[PDB]
Structures are given as C-alpha cells and as structure tokens.
Structure 1
Amino acid sequence: LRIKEIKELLPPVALLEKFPATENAANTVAHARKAIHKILKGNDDRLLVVIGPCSIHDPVAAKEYATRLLALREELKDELEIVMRVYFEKPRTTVGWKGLINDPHMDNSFQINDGLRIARKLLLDINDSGLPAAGEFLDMITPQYLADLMSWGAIGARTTESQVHRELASGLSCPVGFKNGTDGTIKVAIDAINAAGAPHCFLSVTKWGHSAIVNTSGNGDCHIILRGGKEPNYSAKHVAEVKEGLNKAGLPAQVMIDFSHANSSKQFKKQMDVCADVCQQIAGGEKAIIGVMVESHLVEGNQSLEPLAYGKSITDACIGWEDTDALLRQLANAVKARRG
C-alpha cells in the first residue's frame, strides 16, 4: 500500500465550537459579500481590491498587516472595497511548503490540527476587527472549517479546469474568482464560470467530519482573474480580447486583474508597473475591470525556509508596505477619475 499512516482530524464543528464567529465578524463577512455582489451586478462602481501576503505564515505579522490595511480600507472606502489576502493553502508546481494549515510550524511536522486552530483563530480576529478576508479554496476538506469567515474566494490557475473545484465553487457562500490557466488560457476560466453557476450534486465532507452527498444551487457571483501565462495579459489589448470572449459565452464582460505572478513576470516590483497600466485603463473609462489582486506584505521581497525576518514572505515575493499604501491610493485615484 502507498499510505504510510492515518491520523485523527478534528471535525469542523470542533473548530466552529472553539472559535465561533462573533457578531462583528459575521457582519464583516455579510456586508463584504453583499458589497462584492453589488459591484459584480453593476450597482456599484467601486473596485474590489484583494491584497495581502502570498501566504500567511505568522499570525503576529498578519495581525499587524490587517491593522494597517484596515486604516486604508476605511480611508479609501468610497472608491475601493478592500479585502485582505489571508491564504492558508498554497498550490505548488511540484513540491514545497503547502501553507499554514498543512504545516503551521514550517518544519514538515504537518500539525494540521494546530494549523486549523491557528488559521481559524487568525481569520476570526481579522474579521472581528472589521477587515474582510479572501483565500484560495484548494483543498476539498478544509472549507468547512473556514468558509463562514471568507468574503471572497479564489480558485487557482492549476485547478480552474478541475471539475472538483468547480463543484466546490457552486456551493460556496461567497463570490469566487477563477484564474486563467498557467499557460494563459482564458477558456478554462470562462468554462469554469458557467459550470460553477449551475446546480451540482457530489460527494463532500460535512461539518461533522463525515462524507455525504450534497446538492448545490450554483454560484452566480463568479468572475475571471487574469494572472498572465507565457506572457503577461493585463494590457488593454488583452482586456479587450477577454471582454469579447465572455460575451460570446453569455457572461458579463468583467475581469479581475492580478498584478502578480505571471503578470509581473515573477518580480514583485513590477506589480507597480502593472498597477500604473491598469490605472490608466480605469481612469480612461474601462468599466470592465471589476477588481485587482496584489501580493503585498509589511516588508518587500521574500525569504526561504530551505530564525525568520519579520513581515517578509516565505513564498512569492511581495511589495512592501510603502509601495502598498502608494498603490492603493493610485487605484483609488484612478477610480475617482473613471467616475468623472
């Protein structure tokens, strides 16, 4: 057999019981999800900004980052709907650290039970403070432990074509963004949007930790995320091609632009160059750009695991706080312009 060991996993209700959502958290989640729906509908011209660390690996710095982001979110709330990237799971090209839930101690001890406790506790505190959270829904089982605290979800580029993740999205209570494929393929995401908007029936694990059959109603709050492929795809030239591609599919012509990953050619400072370009489209009148995604942290760049520096990514390189404050105002100014 190829399975070496099987260990006990706390059931979702154990985490929900230990860390129940507070009234403030519940409100943060509810208002944030509606606000995003309004933007996706068209009843709102604000820009959805999902911004924060490539991955969370330290609750202390994540808490400090949340406090600074919250101030900006309130200050720029008339132009931006700021949601913090609180990613607990990371998809790897081959092998590597999978995130805080899978291995919180970052030493391959895989204390998943500690991971879930730490993750939910952090998620709860950020929402309770009034700051909404976004995360990638990669794993099929972890959602029951955290979904109630998520205001927006992302389906990775390596799983957007996966029926299992399209199924998951069809039952999620929050808006969902589907990234285009690693090679830059737009089709997989347009297809994913159609599929996740349709009712689904499949096997899942309940809040009680038991497998069951579930039926979903389909998720209408789904959109594409442009994150580049072999070449970047954030340009007006690409945004045009994608708007037409969505209409031809009978979907609203809307996109979220991730300034990182393939769009910045994996060099963190370039996210500022993508920002400038996108802000020109927005300020120019482009009303299809519904939101943006940015990899930001307290300190710029990154560091490897293979004692840590405070507030610096251990996964993808991020822009630092100074660039973050500036990028956010750039986006807000572009929004005030596109308005007129």
Structure 2
Amino acid sequence: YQNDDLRIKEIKELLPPVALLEKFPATENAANTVAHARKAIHKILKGNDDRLLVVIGPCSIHDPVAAKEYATRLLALREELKDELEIVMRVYFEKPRTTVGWKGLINDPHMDNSFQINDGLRIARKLLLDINDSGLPAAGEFLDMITPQYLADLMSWGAIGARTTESQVHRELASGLSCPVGFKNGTDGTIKVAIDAINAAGAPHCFLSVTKWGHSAIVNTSGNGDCHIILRGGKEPNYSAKHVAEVKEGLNKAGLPAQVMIDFSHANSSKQFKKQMDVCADVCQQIAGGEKAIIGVMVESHLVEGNQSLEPLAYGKSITDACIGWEDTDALLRQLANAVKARR
C-alpha cells in the first residue's frame, strides 16, 4: 500500500486478552474481592455509607516481590480499620510521562528498553490475581486503550490521569468500565474538564475498541454513573476546605453529587512525599469536623520511603515518584479511621 508505514519500524505479535484470561483466571476469592469492593465504593458514592475510600500504595509497581509484601502488610490494616475505611491497594503499572520515560512494568518489565510487553502483561495479571486472591482489592490507572481488557476484571477502582481527563477516547473508555472511575483535575488545576469528563463518562457511547480476542470491533457502552473527581493540585494545592467548598459548589451547579477524592501526593504535596502527612492532618480535620463530601483519598506509600533512579536497586523503594514509608503509612491510616470515627 503506497503512502504507508514510513514511520513504523516493526510490528510484533501480541497475546490476545483471552490468552491471559485463560492462563490466569480469577479464582473465586479474587472474583469475590473485586465484586465486593466495587459494590462498597458504589455504596459510598451513593452516600449510603459514611466510610472513606482509601487508595494507597506505590507510585508504580516495578518488583512483584516487594508488591506482594506491601500487599500483605496493607491487608492487615484493611481488616483492622474496615469499619471506617475501604482500603484498596494502588497497583499502577502504566505510567503517564511528561515527555518520555519508563511507561511501566507492562511496557518494559525488565526496565531495560527491551519492551517485552507480553511478559509484562503476564507478570502484571499474575500479581493482580494474587493480590485479589489474598482478599485485597486493587486500583489502577487506565492510560492505554488496549491493556484494560487484560486486567480490568481484577480492578475494583480506576483513575484517568490528569493528562487524559479531557480526552474523548478516555471518557469513552470510562463509560464502559465495570469499576468506578476517578477523574483528576487538569495538570494546571482545571476543575471544569473533570466535571465535563464525569458528565461525558456517565452517558452511553459507541466507539471502536479491541475485544478479548485481540480484534477491533464496534462497542456500545451504558455509561458509568460511578465517576467522581480527584483533587490533585495545580500550580497550587487544592485540598483545603476552601478549595473543597468551591469544588462542591461547582459540582452542584453542574447537577453532580458534591463529593470529592483528595490526592495527598503529586501537586498537592508539591512532589515532596513527607508533606502527604501534612495534607492528611488537614483532611482529617475537615472529615472530623463533619465534611461528608470527602469520600476518598489517595496516598503514595511503599515499604521504604523516598525514591531512586534507574541508574543494584534498593528493595521496596520507588523508582518513580517518592512515597512515604511503612511506619508513616500505618499512622496515616489510623488518623483517617479516627477522623471517620469523629465525623460519625
């Protein structure tokens, strides 16, 4: 075909989703974890449960061993604080970059630009399966249009990144997801695009997508009424009760339930991980004082605090954004459970 493929270097074979679903099917326990966590979050979003959704874990997964260890520690906190918090592990292996960089465990699991994406999908699905099988629900970022078919059945909640909240193809994707979805405000703090995204994702759509068989097809979606905003900061943080009030009034003006998830990290801590503890103190004060609009928080936490460059790597340390460590993580979760107790 003339005029075609000048800038396409190579085309390589990709396992279809059914190969990964057949090799790694959901166990009864894993399926039960997903189904109950989705239902619990739905109940929170409808305002029929005063517990707080807590999405917490590494910025990115690069080592499944450290991830399973983290998951085990977090599951104890989950069972302990279950009357106040719906704790969901952050399991992100699809990173959005400002220009170029490691896009995650799926795109390059060996972290060396070998781009063994078939291996990455196997590793990623096995890890998600093991975590859900242990009883801990998982949350992911939906950046790619094709990877969700391999993993979405093991996801109890999802986030559309700030860089794609305005994008029609991602609003389309959210409209057909089986889990609830958070939309981050814009990388410059724009709330309008996330409200538009929630309204768009709530409506039915018809668009082209790839099936479990690895074939493109026409898909029709129902619309996703389990979508909400995530406050992530802009040029300035936006977690204070002042910003919440403005965000609540905008949601209502737009006909949307006045509820928000607050990300303690990213632009809300100015990309310095220790200040997540500060945001926590502030957010706990709002909740404890009766703020019922705060239905969720997101925290970047790992076994070992800080970060490291892909430049021997340290264990349980982030290779992307800096995270809090486990002792801080333990205290942060109890603070929120206590703040939820007070609000009640």
TM-score exceeds 0.5 = yes
Query: Does the residue aligned with 1:64 lie in a helix, a strand or coil?
Result: helix
Counterpart mapping for 1:122-141 below 5 A: 122-141=127-146
Q: Which residue matches 1:116?
A: 121
Counterpart mapping for 1:148-227 below 5 A: 148-227=153-232
Give the % identical residues.
100
Superposed CA offset, 1:194-248 (max 9, x none): 0000000000000000000000000000000000000000000000000000000
Q: Give distance in 1, aligned partners of 2:39 and 2:227.
A: 13
Query: Does the residue aligned with 1:291 lie in a helix, a strand or coil?
Result: strand
Q: Give distance in 2, aligned partners of 1:235 and 1:67.
A: 32
Q: Which residue matches 1:311?
A: 316
Q: Give distance in 2, aligned partners of 1:149 and 1:122.
A: 10
Superposed CA offset, 1:257-310 (max 9, x none): 000000000000000000000000000000000000000000000000031100
Q: Is 1:281 aligned to 2:281, yes or no? A: no
Q: Give distance in 2, aligned partners of 1:3 and 1:65.
A: 40
Q: Give distance in 2, aligned partners of 1:268 and 1:95.
A: 23
Q: Give distance in 2, aligned partners of 1:78 and 1:304.
A: 39
Q: Is 1:92 aligned to 2:97, yes or no? A: yes
Deviation at 1:108, TM superposition (A): 0.6
Q: Give distance in 2, aligned partners of 1:324 and 1:17.
A: 36
Q: Give distance in 1, aligned partners of 2:7 and 2:234.
A: 35
Q: Give distance in 2, aligned partners of 1:5 and 1:298.
A: 39
Query: Does the residue aligned with 2:110 lie in a helix, a strand or coil?
Result: coil
Q: Give distance in 1, aligned partners of 2:214 and 2:267.
A: 37
Q: Which runs of 5+ in 2 are unaligned?
A: 1-5
Query: Does the residue aligned with 1:153 lie in a helix, a strand or coil?
Result: strand
Q: Is 1:13 aligned to 2:18, yes or no? A: yes
- Normalised by the length of structure 2, the TM-score is 0.98
Deviation at 1:138, TM superposition (A): 0.4
Q: Give distance in 1, aligned partners of 2:222 and 2:114.
A: 38
Q: Give distance in 2, aligned partners of 1:307 and 1:97.
A: 18
Q: Give distance in 2, aligned partners of 1:300 and 1:95.
A: 25
Q: Give distance in 2, aligned partners of 1:2 and 1:268.
A: 40
Query: Does the residue aligned with 2:140 lie in a helix, a strand or coil?
Result: strand
Q: Give distance in 2, aligned partners of 1:290 and 1:185.
A: 20
Q: Give distance in 1, aligned partners of 2:108 and 2:239.
A: 34
- Normalised by the length of structure 1, the TM-score is 0.99
Superposed CA offset, 1:1-47 (max 9, x none): 11111100000000000000000000000000000000000110000
Query: Does the residue aligned with 2:88 lie in a helix, a strand or coil?
Result: strand
Deviation at 1:89, TM superposition (A): 0.3
Q: Is 1:142 aligned to 2:147, yes or no? A: yes
Q: Give distance in 1, aligned partners of 2:64 and 2:188.
A: 33
Q: Give distance in 2, aligned partners of 1:36 and 1:212.
A: 30
Deviation at 1:330, TM superposition (A): 0.4
Q: Which of 255, 271, 284 does residue 260 from structure 2 map onto?
A: 255
Deviation at 1:126, TM superposition (A): 0.0
Q: Give distance in 2, aligned partners of 1:322 and 1:227.
A: 24
Q: Give distance in 2, aligned partners of 1:324 and 1:280.
A: 18
Query: Does the residue aligned with 1:83 lie in a helix, a strand or coil?
Result: strand
Deviation at 1:88, TM superposition (A): 1.1
Q: Give distance in 2, aligned partners of 1:221 and 1:128.
A: 24
Deviation at 1:334, TM superposition (A): 0.3
Q: Give distance in 2, aligned partners of 1:331 and 1:256.
A: 13
Deviation at 1:68, TM superposition (A): 0.2
Q: Give distance in 1, aligned partners of 2:186 and 2:108.
A: 27
Superposed CA offset, 1:143-172 (max 9, x none): 000000000000000000000000000000
Deviation at 1:70, TM superposition (A): 0.1
Q: Which of 246, 250, 256 does residue 251 from structure 2 map onto?
A: 246
Superposed CA offset, 1:94-140 (max 9, x none): 11110100000000100000000000000000000000000000000
Q: Give distance in 2, aligned partners of 1:97 and 1:277.
A: 33
Superposed CA offset, 1:32-74 (max 9, x none): 0000000000110000000000000000000000000000000
Q: Give distance in 2, aligned partners of 1:274 and 1:158.
A: 23
Structure 1, 115-124 or 301-310: larger mean CA deviation: 301-310
Q: Give distance in 2, aligned partners of 1:98 and 1:181.
A: 20
